[PDB]
Amino acid sequence: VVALGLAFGTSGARAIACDFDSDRSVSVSVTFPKTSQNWPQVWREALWQLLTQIPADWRSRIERIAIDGTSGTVLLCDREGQPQTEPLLYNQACPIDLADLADWVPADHAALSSTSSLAKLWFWQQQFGALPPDWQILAQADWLSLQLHGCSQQSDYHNALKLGYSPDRERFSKNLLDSELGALLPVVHEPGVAIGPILPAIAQEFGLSPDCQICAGTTDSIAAFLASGAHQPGEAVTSLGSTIVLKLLSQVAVSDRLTGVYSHKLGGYWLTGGASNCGGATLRQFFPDTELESLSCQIDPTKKSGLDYYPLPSRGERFPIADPDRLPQLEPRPENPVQFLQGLLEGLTQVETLGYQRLQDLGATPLKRIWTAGGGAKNAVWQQLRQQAIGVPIAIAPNTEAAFGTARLAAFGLAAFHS
């Protein structure tokens, strides 16, 4: 099977078509402008540009397509899918009373956030008088795949979570469905299942097979986890980026109020995780990237530095332990910048260690091994510190592109995530 993944991120989009029988692939990209008066136009146009860059011989062989988009970027559209107002982006918060959402979702549901899709929908309900029942709210991924299969009000249970979906009971609440917002909600499917064939006109225009199937999508974060290929409870992916992001596959759903930990359904399993404010940004505050290698190769991880840093880039921590007034702790300073860097790496290591331990203590499946992504993944000193602290196998993730994760989704769905 040849499959196509399309991944829409915060600053651009990437398409990867993969032939999984020959292990062959092609990857194309588009970069978003940093300003627009019509972002939906930008995204749709990007979709066509991506398709157009894929070689015609690849296009004629693609039989499944899936799309991931940024979590919490949503559009308010009419019955035809035409946006009726500017999108509300993933990072935009709405000034609403979360109490107004209390009867529509469980106690500490993840949708109870000023930046959630549900909050944005209610916000639109405040700004408009009453929202016409024939309208619809669509996540970025939803809207984009709609461009390919034509079926309105269709989403997946990843994107839908922040809209108020409860994947533990595979439903929206009866209270939400019967409310004024109910008519605008999508029908929610499992990521990777076929929603419908490609639109005939789109197939002919782009030289795709008219029997090509468009699948339910996912989020960009989740697609990045799918890229790793990990599918056994206890397997995790650490993203050593500007911030440290942990994702852990678990037999059981876990969550935590103060730290905002929650879980996505992933087949018969659950994907939990957390994001610290600590990360590579802290390192960049003291060392140019060229200097980090020069110094790293001078560190012997087998001997302790004696330093006990908490490597925040600024005030406040959210995970593993929430403290809005948590201070960066970078004292004392050694004379040697090698030793200072070692202390920083030890602190970041402690953040990862404590993170997975916390997740386990919340009930997640005990860590079995770690796949590493991001800028810090190729740092072997840091990897050694992490192995020593955590005591499970750690390696660089084979693949880290959201588009490749989404290609795998298109091709195999979530079948691997069952016993």
Author numbering: 2 to 420
What do the authors say?
Synpcc7942_2462 from the cyanobacteria Synechococcus elongatus PCC 7942 encodes a putative sugar kinase (SePSK), and this kinase contains 426 amino acids. SePSK and AtXK-1 display a sequence identity of 44.9%, and belong to the ribulokinase-like carbohydrate kinases, a sub-family of FGGY family carbohydrate kinases. Domain I exhibits a ribonuclease H-like folding pattern, and is responsible for the substrate binding, while domain II possesses an actin-like ATPase domain that binds cofactor ATP.
Our results suggested that three conserved residues (D8, T11 and D221 of SePSK) play an important role in SePSK function. To identify the function of these three residues of SePSK, we constructed D8A, T11A and D221A mutants. Our SePSK structure shows that the Asp8 residue forms strong hydrogen bond with RBL2. The results implied that the second RBL binding site plays a role in the D-ribulose kinase function of SePSK.
